[PDB]
Amino acid sequence: KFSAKRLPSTRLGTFLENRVNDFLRRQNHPESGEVTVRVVHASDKTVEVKPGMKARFVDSGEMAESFPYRTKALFAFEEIDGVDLCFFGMHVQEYGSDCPPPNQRRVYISYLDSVHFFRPKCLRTAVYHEILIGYLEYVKKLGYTTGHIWACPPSEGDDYIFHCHPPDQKIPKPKRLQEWYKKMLDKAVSERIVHDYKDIFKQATEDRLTSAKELPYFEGDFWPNVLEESIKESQKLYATMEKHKEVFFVIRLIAGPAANSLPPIVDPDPLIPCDLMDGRDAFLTLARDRHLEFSSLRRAQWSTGCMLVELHTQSQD
Ligand SMILES: CC(=O)N[C@H](CCCCNC(=O)CSCCNC(=O)CCNC(=O)[C@H](O)C(C)(C)COP(=O)(O)OP(=O)(O)OC[C@H]1O[C@@H](n2cnc3c(N)ncnc32)[C@H](O)[C@@H]1OP(=O)(O)O)C(N)=O
Ligand SMILES: [Br-]
Ligand SMILES: [Br-]
Ligand SMILES: [Br-]
Ligand SMILES: [Br-]
Numbered sequence: 001k002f003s004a005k006r007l008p009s010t011r012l013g014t015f016l017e018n019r020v021n022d023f024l025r026r027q028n029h030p031e032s033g034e035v036t037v038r039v040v041h042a043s044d045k046t047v048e049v050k051p052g053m054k055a056r057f058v059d060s061g062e063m064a065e066s067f068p069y070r071t072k073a074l075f076a077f078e079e080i081d082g083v084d085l086c087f088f089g090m091h092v093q094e095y096g097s098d099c100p101p102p103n104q105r106r107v108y109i110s111y112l113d114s115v116h117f118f119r120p121k122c123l124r125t126a127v128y129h130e131i132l133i134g135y136l137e138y139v140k141k142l143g144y145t146t147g148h149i150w151a152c153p154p155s156e157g158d159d160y161i162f163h164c165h166p167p168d169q170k171i172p173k174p175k176r177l178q179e180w181y182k183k184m185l186d187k188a189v190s191e192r193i194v195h196d197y198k199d200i201f202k203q204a205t206e207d208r209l210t211s212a213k214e215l216p217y218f219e220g221d222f223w224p225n226v227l228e229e230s231i232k233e234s235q236k237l238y239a240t241m242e243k244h245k246e247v248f249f250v251i252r253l254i255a256g257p258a259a260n261s262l263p264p265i266v267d268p269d270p271l272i273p274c275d276l277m278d279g280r281d282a283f284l285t286l287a288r289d290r291h292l293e294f295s296s297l298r299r300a301q302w303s304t305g306c307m308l309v310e311l312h313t314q315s316q317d
Pocket of ligand 2: 031119121122
């Protein structure tokens with residue numbers, strides 16, 4: 001059986017799908033279907049400090065040369081008339097309690113994407129928010145203190161995770177996407193999951209940061225690249241932060257003394273080797289090469305079926 005449900009379970013996937021299905025049960029909409037959430041890749045990675053920051057802070061011993069993290073890919077599926085549809089995906093980076101500062105106990109969203117066929121329409125955004133809030137709830141429980149989001153929509157015609165979106169799925173502009181994150185985070189605050197959140201500039205100001213070495217350094221993020229582009233010739237950094245403040249969310253999960261003397265992060269879930277889902281490139285390539293598209297409900301369901309066969313058959317022993 002090559003179903004979504006039959007993909008191996010994880011504590012995280014179970015936590016998220018239980019949150020979503022409980023939410024759906026509360027809404028009691030006759031058209032909602034069972035949601036399945038699965039983590040389909042988890043691996044150890046490191047992010048190397050680029051040359052320039054390496055020459056400036058690493059070679060002096062002020063900063064680590066690299067930061068270890070775990071990457072996880074997760075997907076959500078909904079049953080519609082008994083057929084599974086993959087409608088949401090996310091790649092995250094998790095920096096544990098053993099990781100050197102400035103990255104310890106932080107999570108970062110690498111990529112998030114969706115295809116707009118969730119049934120019913122009126123619960124789609126709500127379910128996306130339930131997944132995101134659930135993710136923050138879960139990592140807070142593990143002892144991660146801070147979440148980080150670069151709220152940047154894809155460029156015209158580009159796909160983050162799913163190949164060939166529906167032509168009529170509008171892509172939000174920056175302001176709309178920013179507001180979307182504020183709505184999600186305001187809900188999380190009301191549920192006492194998030195303590196508070198700040199834009200990157202306000203965060204740096206309140207922290208009284210005085211050196212670029214203090215800013216969290218994530219794989220593929222804007223800030224390592226802008227630090228390199230700036231270094232070609234700290235006040236620059238502050239200026240760049242103010243200019244792009246509204247794009248970058250810093251989400252405080254644990255505050256005050258509660259954040260001070262935490263035990264180590266222990267993740268109960270094992271690594272999950274899966275080359276197909278090691279970052280976003282391999283799945284886009286599979287979809288492109290096999291002429292799969294997520295461009296209509298029926299096409300998306302077909303492509304979901306094909307994705308599932310490949311996930312199961314890559315995983316077999
Ligand atoms: C390297 C570099 O330089 N740069 C980058 C840096 C990478 C950063 C990566 N960061 C991340 O991944 C985190 S930010 C997440 C960004 N991901 C995406 O945006 C993927 C494409 N978008 C989506 O999947 C969805 O829009 C989603 C974000 C899931 C929200 O779906 P939704 O449905 O809840 O809300 P809605 O979409 O606002 O729609 C809600 C309503 O708004 C409507 N709507 C949406 N957009 C528009 C619009 N443009 N104009 C008018 N209306 C509009 C939509 O029709 C709808 O109407 P209704 O409810 O009446 O039907 C790089 N690495 O390449
Ligand atoms: Br509907
Ligand atoms: Br609607
Ligand atoms: Br909580
Ligand atoms: Br592959």
